[PDB]
Amino acid sequence: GPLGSGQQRAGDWKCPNPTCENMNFSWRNECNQCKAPKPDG
């Protein structure tokens, strides 16, 4: 089916790295794959 373990919640954020674009949970401050910061610095 179209269902899966994936989810979406308010405050979530996508990796700013063009080489990553991974979706990250709201409580993370860095990317789950490329460790790129959520803020611009």
Next chain:
RNA sequence: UGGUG
């Protein structure tokens, strides 16, 4: 921790 569906 809601982790790769």
